[PDB]
Short mmCIF file of C-alpha atoms and ligand atoms in Angstrom, two decimals:
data_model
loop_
_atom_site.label_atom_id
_atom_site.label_comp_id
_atom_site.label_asym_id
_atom_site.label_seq_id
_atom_site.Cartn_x
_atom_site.Cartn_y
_atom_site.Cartn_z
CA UNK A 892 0.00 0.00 0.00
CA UNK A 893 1.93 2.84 1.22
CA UNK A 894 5.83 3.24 -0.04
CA UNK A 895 4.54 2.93 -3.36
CA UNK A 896 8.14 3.69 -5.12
CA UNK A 897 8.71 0.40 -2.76
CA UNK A 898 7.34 -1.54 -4.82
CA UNK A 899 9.34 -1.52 -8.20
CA UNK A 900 12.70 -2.50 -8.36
CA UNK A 901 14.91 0.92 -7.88
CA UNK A 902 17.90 0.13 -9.58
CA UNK A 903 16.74 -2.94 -12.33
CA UNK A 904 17.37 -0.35 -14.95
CA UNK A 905 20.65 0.63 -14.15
CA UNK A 906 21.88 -2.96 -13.74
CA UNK A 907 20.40 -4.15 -17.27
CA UNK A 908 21.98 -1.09 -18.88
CA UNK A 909 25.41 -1.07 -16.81
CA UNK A 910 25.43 -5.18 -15.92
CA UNK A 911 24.04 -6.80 -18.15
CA UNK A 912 21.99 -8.85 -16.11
CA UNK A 913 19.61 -11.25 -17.45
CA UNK A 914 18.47 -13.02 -14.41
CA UNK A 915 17.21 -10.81 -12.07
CA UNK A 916 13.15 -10.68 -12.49
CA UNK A 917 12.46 -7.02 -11.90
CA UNK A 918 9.45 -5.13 -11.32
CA UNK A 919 8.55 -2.35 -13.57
CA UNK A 920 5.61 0.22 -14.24
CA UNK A 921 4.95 1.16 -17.71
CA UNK A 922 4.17 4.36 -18.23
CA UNK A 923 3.53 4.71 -22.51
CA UNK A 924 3.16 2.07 -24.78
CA UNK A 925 3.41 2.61 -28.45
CA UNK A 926 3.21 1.10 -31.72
CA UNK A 927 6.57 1.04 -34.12
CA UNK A 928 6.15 1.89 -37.56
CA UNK A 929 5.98 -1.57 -39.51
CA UNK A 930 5.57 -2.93 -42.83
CA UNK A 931 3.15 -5.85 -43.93
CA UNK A 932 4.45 -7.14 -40.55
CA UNK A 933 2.88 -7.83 -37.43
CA UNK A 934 2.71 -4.88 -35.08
CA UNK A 935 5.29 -4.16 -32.58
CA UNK A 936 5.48 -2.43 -29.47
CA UNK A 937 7.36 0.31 -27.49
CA UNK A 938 7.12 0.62 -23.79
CA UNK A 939 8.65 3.53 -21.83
CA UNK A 940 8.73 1.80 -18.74
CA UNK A 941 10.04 2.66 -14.75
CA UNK A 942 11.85 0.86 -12.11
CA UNK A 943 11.25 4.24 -9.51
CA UNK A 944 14.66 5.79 -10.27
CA UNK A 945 15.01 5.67 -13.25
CA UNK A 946 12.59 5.73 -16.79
CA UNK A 947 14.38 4.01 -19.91
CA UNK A 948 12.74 4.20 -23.40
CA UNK A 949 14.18 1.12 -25.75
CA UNK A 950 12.03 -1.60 -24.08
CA UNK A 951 9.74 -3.56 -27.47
CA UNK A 952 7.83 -6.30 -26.38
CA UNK A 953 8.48 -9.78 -27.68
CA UNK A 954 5.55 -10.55 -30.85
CA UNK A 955 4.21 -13.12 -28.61
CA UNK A 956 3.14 -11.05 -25.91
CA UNK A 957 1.00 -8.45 -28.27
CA UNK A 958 -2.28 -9.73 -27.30
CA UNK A 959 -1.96 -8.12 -23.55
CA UNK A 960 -1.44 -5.16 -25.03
CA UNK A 961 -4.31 -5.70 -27.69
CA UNK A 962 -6.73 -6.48 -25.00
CA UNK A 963 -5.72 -4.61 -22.19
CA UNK A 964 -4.15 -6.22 -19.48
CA UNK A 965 -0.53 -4.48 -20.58
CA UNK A 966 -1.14 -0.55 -20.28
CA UNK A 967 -0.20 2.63 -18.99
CA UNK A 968 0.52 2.61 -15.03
CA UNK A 969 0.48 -0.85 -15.20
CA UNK A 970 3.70 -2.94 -13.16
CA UNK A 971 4.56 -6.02 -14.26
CA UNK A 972 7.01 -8.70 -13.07
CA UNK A 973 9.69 -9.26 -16.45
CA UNK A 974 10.37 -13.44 -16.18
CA UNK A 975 12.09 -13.33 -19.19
CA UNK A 976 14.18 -10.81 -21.56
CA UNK A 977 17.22 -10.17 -23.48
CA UNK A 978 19.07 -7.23 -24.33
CA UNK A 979 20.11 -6.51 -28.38
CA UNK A 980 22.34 -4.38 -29.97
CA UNK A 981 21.63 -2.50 -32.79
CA UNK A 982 23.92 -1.60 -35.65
CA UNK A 983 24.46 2.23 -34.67
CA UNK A 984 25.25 1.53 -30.75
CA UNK A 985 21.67 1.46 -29.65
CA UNK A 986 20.53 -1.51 -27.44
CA UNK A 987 17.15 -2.53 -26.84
CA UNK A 988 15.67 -4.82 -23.93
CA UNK A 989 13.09 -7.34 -25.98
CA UNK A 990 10.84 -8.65 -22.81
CA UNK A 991 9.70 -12.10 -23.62
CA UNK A 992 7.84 -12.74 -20.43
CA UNK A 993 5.86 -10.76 -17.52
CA UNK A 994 3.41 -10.82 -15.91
CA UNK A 995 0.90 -8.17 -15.09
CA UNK A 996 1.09 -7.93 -10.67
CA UNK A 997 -1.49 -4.65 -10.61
CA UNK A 998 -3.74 -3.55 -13.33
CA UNK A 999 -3.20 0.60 -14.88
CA UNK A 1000 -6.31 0.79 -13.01
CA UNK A 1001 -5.54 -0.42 -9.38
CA UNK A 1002 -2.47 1.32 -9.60
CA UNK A 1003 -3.68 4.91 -11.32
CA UNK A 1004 -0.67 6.53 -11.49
CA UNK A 1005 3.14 6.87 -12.59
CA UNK A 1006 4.86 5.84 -9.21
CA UNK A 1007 7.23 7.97 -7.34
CA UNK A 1008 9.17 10.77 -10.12
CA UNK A 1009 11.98 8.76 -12.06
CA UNK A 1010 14.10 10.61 -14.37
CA UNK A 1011 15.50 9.03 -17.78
CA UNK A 1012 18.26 6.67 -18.30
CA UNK A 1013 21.09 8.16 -19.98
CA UNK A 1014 21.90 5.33 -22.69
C1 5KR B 350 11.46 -2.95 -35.50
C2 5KR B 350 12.32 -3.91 -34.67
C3 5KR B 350 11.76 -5.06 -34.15
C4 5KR B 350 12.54 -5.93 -33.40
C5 5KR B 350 13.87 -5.64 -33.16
C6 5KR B 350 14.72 -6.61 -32.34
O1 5KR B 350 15.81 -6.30 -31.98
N1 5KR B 350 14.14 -7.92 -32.06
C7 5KR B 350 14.77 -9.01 -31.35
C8 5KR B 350 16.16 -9.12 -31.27
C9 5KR B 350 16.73 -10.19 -30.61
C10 5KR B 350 15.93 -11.16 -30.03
C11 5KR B 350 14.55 -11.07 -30.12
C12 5KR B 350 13.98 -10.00 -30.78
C13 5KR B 350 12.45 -9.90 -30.88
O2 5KR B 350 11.91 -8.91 -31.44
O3 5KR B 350 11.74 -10.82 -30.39
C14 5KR B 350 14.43 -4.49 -33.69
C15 5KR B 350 13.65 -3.63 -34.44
S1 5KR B 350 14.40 -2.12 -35.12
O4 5KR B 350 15.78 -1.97 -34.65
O5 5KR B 350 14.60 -2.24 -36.57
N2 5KR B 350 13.46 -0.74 -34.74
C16 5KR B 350 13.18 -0.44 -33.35
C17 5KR B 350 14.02 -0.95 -32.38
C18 5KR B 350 13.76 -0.67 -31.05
C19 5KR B 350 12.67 0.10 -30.70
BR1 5KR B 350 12.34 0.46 -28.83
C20 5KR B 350 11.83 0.61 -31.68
C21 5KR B 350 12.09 0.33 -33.01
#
């Protein structure tokens, strides 16, 4: 209930980006979600999402997991437990954090808000 930046994991961000780390299972808030430009292919989506300190921008979600998105359970203000992701690198430097699995712990609507006031990642 109360603490409510005590709840995501401060600092998940930071170790992806910095560590590397693949293992831990951290909880995150998303605060946007967006659609990528695609071709004849099937939709993809951006999430800005939170870990309390810190927002970071380059997370897509893996093709499988587009249905919570297309009906609902994935949204804004919405934190999630990531069981499963990997981080890629792009050609021009760029890397990207492709979550394959989470799970939704509080709805956008029992949670209502962007938790605590992160600031973003400098990648
Ligand atoms: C469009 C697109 C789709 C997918 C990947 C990708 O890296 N996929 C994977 C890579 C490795 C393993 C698994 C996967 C997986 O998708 O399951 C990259 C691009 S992109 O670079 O051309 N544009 C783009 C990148 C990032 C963000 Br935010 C917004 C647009």
């Amino acid at each position: 209930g109360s603490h409510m930046v005590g709840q995501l994991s401060r600092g998940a961000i930071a170790a992806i980006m910095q560590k590397g780390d693949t293992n831990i299972k951290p909880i995150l808030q998303v605060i946007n979600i967006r659609p990528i430009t695609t071709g004849n292919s099937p939709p993809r989506y951006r999430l800005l999402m939170s870990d309390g300190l810190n927002t970071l921008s380059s997370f897509m979600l893996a093709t499988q997991l587009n249905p919570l998105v297309e009906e609902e359970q994935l949204s804004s203000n919405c934190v999630c437990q990531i069981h499963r992701f990997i981080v890629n690198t792009l050609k021009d430097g760029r890397r990207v954090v492709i979550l394959m699995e989470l799970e939704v712990l509080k709805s956008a609507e029992a949670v209502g808000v962007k938790i605590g006031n992160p600031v973003p990642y400098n990648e």
